[PDB]
From Swiss-Prot, chains A, B, C, D:
GO terms for biological process: acetylcholine-mediated vasodilation involved in regulation of systemic arterial blood pressure; cellular response to ethanol; cellular response to oxidative stress; detection of oxygen; erythrophore differentiation; glutathione metabolic process; heart development; hemopoiesis. Its EC number is 1.15.1.1. Its main location: mitochondrion. GO terms for molecular function: DNA binding; enzyme binding; identical protein binding; manganese ion binding; oxygen binding; superoxide dismutase activity. This is Superoxide dismutase [Mn], mitochondrial. Belongs to the iron/manganese superoxide dismutase family.
């Protein structure tokens, strides 16, 4: 049974970049609903599968991807942020960034471009392509999860759904992006990056 | 050259169902940006077309549909609302509603279901199917316009993008839907409906 | 554990409308492959679900919809055809056709249009809308099944993937569509329709 | 005003890898039809744009992408093949292949996999990423063109729509893929690649 993970920090630990109201609603309501909805959908799929009901299985895909993706994306997102985040990585991750995007600053501009470029709801991602053995930026619509839909391993995700910033920044997503860089938990992004080595 | 249409009423004319802050941002920022962006995209398409650059034409489709759809959807949305709206239609529109959905109340439940059911950004619509000669409910993702993508003629649209309600109702879209019924401008929906007769 | 259903007739029974070579390849290769692939994908989804691996479940969705839909669609298709078929349906089904589409010929033109209009691979369908209690025509891309993706109950399906007609009709899909009316098993379509009333 | 390009060789010049019947139908029917359809759709878009009819412009998008992409993709495809082709590329292109994919054989396996993996109609492509300055393999659905929908520059394309191989290879697409390597015009792929450096 899937469960809602506790936030790694208090709801106001990211102020003033992302206000506590946002953090509380985003976690206790948005992520919470996805988890309960996911459990309900998985239950239905096990029944449809046991009866070999392919039509039911197909009809349940949108709900499974949306609530499942919602759980996957937010679980990673929380760890991607930290009160002591910000600045830039150091070591292998940093070297990969410069290698694949030219410079950290260039990388920031590219991931920002992908995030701001999302038309409708979605996420901007910095991922790792195991096949190519390099970093790659990608954008996903709605709650479609990065690995489940592209195969790329998620390192850093930026939620550009309006509920992730509208209460504080309104229609100006670029202001939201500019601010979030101040809280990126590079220690966690680095750990996720190294996990792809082994 | 496309232009931003004036709101048929003041920004606070729909209180308390949709607060004035929402109305001002939604109109002066969201709809406004779409119009200017549309004009810019149309300019680019005329050039690509003149040079017979099919690749450019294809690359510009997402922007044309999104900003074009944005202009189309919001232009209709404003007229779909009114300070003196609410209640239910009377005459042919009402008879069609009962005929195709059983009862006005049933119709309200169905269009609400379609609107609340949107995963991600989108719109709920009550449209007219000229081919079948009857009413039909449909949901569209992001800014995809109803007639341009489904052929159905738009009668009543419900914006379920989070920017349309988050500041007032937060994550609870159902509360937003319940409230919007109080401001539906049935006079305009009826006019749009009759225009399909001729 | 899904199995390939025996065809209701001999591979050359639909001659000369759909030749024996196509019938044999379509059943023994295309449909058979979807069946084998479906059993494999379902087994993997069983493992994913039991492990609570949401990423794997999501990654399996395209294969499940593609191969499962393949099994669903062709199973119905075989029963929708007959060597002693053709002509027109009678009783209630025919009444509905005239009611919902105007006449039998208008219905044919509409289903043909939807079928010839498919860009890429897909299917044309005559389905029943349980919510609206009336007939409805629809087109589905690739192997996306009617009920699983639209909620509509399938009554008559027309496979417009190129393997359904190329060997005999080459690029002229309209010729295939004209010929298939000669083998439509209205007895079966009627059963599916009446099974909707109950 | 777009025109159908003459084939660079005789219809039976690619025998026995791709037979003459397929080559003739593919060029004179499939590609020719896309050209005619494209000119028609572009003319309608010219009228829509001049009128400021955003709904019509949006409604024309599927036809424009489908027929325009058809023109783009096949035009490149013809030049990607040759009767005296086959073997392997040399110089820089070959260097990049080993660099980006490991070896020529690994590249072949990867392009083949992407091509055989297309569910429904589509294309497998070897393209150049100008942003990352490296080779990249990608698959496109139906006639969606590489550059117009992915920004990648097309170097080598493989049509996996069933009309590209069914008459000769029937359902065994892998056999088609194996055979096509014998007629790849590496001279042309090289030109497209070098044209990316400048
Ligand atoms: Mn979120
Ligand atoms: Mn809006
Ligand atoms: Mn088939
Ligand atoms: Mn082709």
């Amino acid at each position: 049974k899937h469960s809602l993970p506790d936030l790694p920090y208090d709801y106001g630990a990211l102020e003033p970049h992302i206000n506590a109201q946002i953090m509380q609603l985003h976690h206790s309501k948005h992520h919470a609903a996805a988890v309960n909805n996911l459990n309900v959908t998985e239950e239905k799929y096990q029944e449809a599968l046991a009866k070999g009901d392919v039509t039911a299985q197909i009809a349940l895909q949108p709900a499974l991807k949306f609530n499942g993706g919602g759980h996957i994306n937010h679980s990673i997102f929380w760890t991607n942020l930290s009160p002591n985040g910000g600045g830039e990585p150091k070591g292998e991750l940093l070297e990969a960034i410069k290698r694949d995007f030219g410079s950290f600053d260039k990388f920031k501009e590219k991931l920002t471009a992908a995030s701001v470029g999302v038309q409708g709801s979605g996420w901007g991602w910095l991922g790792f392509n195991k096949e190519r053995g390099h970093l790659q930026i990608a954008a996903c619509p709605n709650q479609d999860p990065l690995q489940g839909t592209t195969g790329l391993i998620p390192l850093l995700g930026i939620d550009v759904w309006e509920h992730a910033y509208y209460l504080q920044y309104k229609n100006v997503r670029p202001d939201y992006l500019k601010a979030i860089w101040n809280v990126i938990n590079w220690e966690n992004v680095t750990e996720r990056y190294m996990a792809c080595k082994k």
